[PDB]
Design an enzyme around this catalytic site. Structure first.
Site, PDB file in Angstrom:
ATOM      1  N   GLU A  90       4.782   4.767   1.274  1.00 17.20           N
ATOM      2  CA  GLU A  90       5.783   3.707   1.329  1.00 17.20           C
ATOM      3  C   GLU A  90       5.347   2.490   0.521  1.00 17.20           C
ATOM      4  O   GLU A  90       6.192   1.766  -0.017  1.00 17.20           O
ATOM      5  CB  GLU A  90       6.048   3.366   2.799  1.00 17.20           C
ATOM      6  CG  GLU A  90       7.217   2.439   3.124  1.00 17.20           C
ATOM      7  CD  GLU A  90       6.866   0.969   3.011  1.00 17.20           C
ATOM      8  OE1 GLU A  90       5.681   0.628   3.219  1.00 17.20           O
ATOM      9  OE2 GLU A  90       7.762   0.152   2.725  1.00 17.20           O
ATOM     10  N   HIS A  91       4.040   2.250   0.432  1.00 12.38           N
ATOM     11  CA  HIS A  91       3.548   1.209  -0.467  1.00 12.38           C
ATOM     12  C   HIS A  91       3.630   1.641  -1.928  1.00 12.38           C
ATOM     13  O   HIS A  91       3.980   0.836  -2.797  1.00 12.38           O
ATOM     14  CB  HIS A  91       2.114   0.839  -0.107  1.00 12.38           C
ATOM     15  CG  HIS A  91       2.017   0.030   1.139  1.00 12.38           C
ATOM     16  ND1 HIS A  91       2.432   0.508   2.362  1.00 12.38           N
ATOM     17  CD2 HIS A  91       1.578  -1.232   1.356  1.00 12.38           C
ATOM     18  CE1 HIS A  91       2.250  -0.425   3.279  1.00 12.38           C
ATOM     19  NE2 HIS A  91       1.726  -1.486   2.694  1.00 12.38           N
TER      20      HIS A  91
ATOM     21  N   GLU B 159      -4.088  -5.881   5.219  1.00 11.57           N
ATOM     22  CA  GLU B 159      -3.008  -6.214   6.127  1.00 11.57           C
ATOM     23  C   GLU B 159      -3.402  -5.759   7.520  1.00 11.57           C
ATOM     24  O   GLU B 159      -3.268  -6.508   8.472  1.00 11.57           O
ATOM     25  CB  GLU B 159      -1.672  -5.608   5.684  1.00 11.57           C
ATOM     26  CG  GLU B 159      -1.617  -4.096   5.641  1.00 11.57           C
ATOM     27  CD  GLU B 159      -0.319  -3.583   5.051  1.00 11.57           C
ATOM     28  OE1 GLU B 159       0.637  -4.378   4.936  1.00 11.57           O
ATOM     29  OE2 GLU B 159      -0.252  -2.387   4.701  1.00 11.57           O
TER      30      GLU B 159
END
Lengths: 54, 403
Positions: free
Chosen positions: B51-52, B128
């Site tokens: 997804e990144h 993150e």
């Protein structure tokens, strides 16, 4: 035997109470132990872990 | 009078669903039945890391030129991943409908994962996560999922453990991509100013290449004690019914009845024949136990003493809610994608209204007694949680001696 009876007319009645007491305690002690080990299992399975943020 | 959601199917199995409306901007998305539940602990962050990587360039559109295209029409590009579903959606104008679909086609197939990028996105993801711990409610809900679904693929988080994040390679990703991106497990959903025939022709033109190929809740407790935090977050849940079980609707009405802690939120998270139904509250240490007591009382009241007035209020709150949502294009497309992935069809709002109006107080307290009364909960606490009661007190608060 008679003098004994005299000194304890309840000898027979008691022993019947003691037999009922042994049967009731043999029923009730493992069940109360099982309830205690239920309510203490939670902790006795608790796993602690130290996670300093490091 | 709400327009119906029309669903077609390509040979690939990619159901192309659309719901036209006057609005001239549209939300076209791709919904994939692939999440952290389909990962096998050796690729626990593959969906998140893909997804990144999915917006960093494809084979046909190498690098930032791709996102230059989605800047050129002024469109917005979003993606998200849950434990069961992955979504890639674009909000754009109506007249830019073809190229957007073509863009989405690249994002699902022909995507390019650059090794250079892999290291950069690893540092992004790693960092993150290294700071994600900051968000408490996310930590508490991850703890609740872990302790409620111990030993299953539903315990593991969407992001995965830092370990896997560092240890991931193109080929692994390629696998997850080539394994969980099958055409029969994909929905192309469109909401707003779109024509269904034009969208079907665009899906036939591009995206017609996509290849065609025991969940358990464990009543448990995780307590992360850290007394330096100012506030405590506590989530208590029981097992939910799942997506396809209709009494979810009734349970939603029950949540609408509940709606002492600074923040009190009720949730009904649903996965494929499972879920978490409960409450999350964030509180000062010296209030925590009282909150819990309060909360449990309300649940038992809904199991025992539900009246018609609060049921009517909960039905009105639910109706308004579902209809308040499903308003903007995105919210809708999102509903089309989830409805085709979970139910296999788009449930119209009239059917939702019928299932709401058939709910009365008797079946609400019956279903609440089925799902809340005398059930073993999953508890997740984070913060100053010493006065948070242990499992016997919560389990005893899950029933009443007076019924």
């Amino acid at each position: 035997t008679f003098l004994r009876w005299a000194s304890e007319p309840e000898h027979d009645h008691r022993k019947r109470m003691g037999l009922k007491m042994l049967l009731m305690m043999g029923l009730l002690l493992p069940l109360t132990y099982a309830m205690k080990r239920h309510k203490w299992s939670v902790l006795k399975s608790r796993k602690l872990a130290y996670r300093p943020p490091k | 009078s709400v327009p119906e959601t029309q669903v077609s199917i390509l040979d690939n199995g990619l159901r192309v669903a659309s719901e036209q409306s006057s609005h001239a901007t549209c939300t076209v998305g791709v919904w994939i039945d692939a999440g952290s539940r389909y990962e096998t602990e050796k690729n626990n962050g593959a969906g998140y890391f893909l997804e990144h990587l999915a917006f960093k360039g494809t084979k046909n559109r190498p690098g930032n030129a791709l996102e230059k295209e989605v800047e050129s029409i002024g469109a917005h590009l979003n993606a998200y991943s849950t434990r069961e579903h992955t979504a890639y959606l674009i909000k754009a104008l109506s007249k830019d409908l073809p190229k957007v679909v073509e863009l989405l086609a690249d994002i699902v197939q022909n995507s390019s994962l650059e090794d250079s990028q892999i290291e950069k996105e690893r540092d992004v993801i790693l960092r993150e996560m290294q700071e994600n711990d900051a968000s408490m409610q996310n930590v508490v809900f991850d703890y609740l999922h872990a302790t409620a679904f111990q030993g299953t693929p539903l315990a593991q988080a969407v992001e995965g453990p830092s370990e896997n994040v560092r240890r991931l390679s193109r080929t692994d990703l390629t696998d997850y991509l080539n394994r969980h991106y099958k055409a029969p497990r994909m929905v192309l959903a469109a909401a707003g100013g779109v024509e269904h025939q034009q969208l079907l022709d665009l899906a036939q033109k591009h995206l017609s290449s996509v290849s065609r190929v025991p969940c358990r809740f464990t009543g448990s407790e995780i307590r992360h004690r850290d007394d330096a935090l100012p506030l405590a977050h506590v989530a208590i849940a029981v097992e939910g019914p799942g997506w396809a079980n209709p009494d979810n609707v009734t349970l939603q009405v029950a949540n609408a009845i509940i709606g002492l802690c600074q923040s009190f939120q009720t949730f009904n998270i649903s996965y494929s024949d499972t879920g978490l139904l409960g409450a999350h509250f964030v509180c000062d240490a010296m209030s925590i136990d009282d909150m819990v007591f309060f909360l449990q009382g309300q649940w038992m009241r809904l199991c025992t003493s539900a009246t018609e007035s609060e049921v009517t209020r909960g039905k009105n709150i639910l109706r308004n809610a579902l209809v308040s949502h499903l308003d903007g294009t995105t919210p809708v497309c999102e509903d089309i994608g989830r409805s085709l992935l979970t139910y296999g069809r788009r449930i119209p709002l009239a059917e939702w209204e019928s299932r709401i109006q058939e709910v009365d107080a008797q079946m609400l307290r019956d279903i609440c007694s089925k799902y809340f009364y005398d059930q073993c909960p999953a508890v997740a606490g984070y913060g100053p949680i010493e006065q948070l009661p242990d499992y016997n007190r919560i389990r005893s608060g899950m029933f009443w001696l007076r019924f």
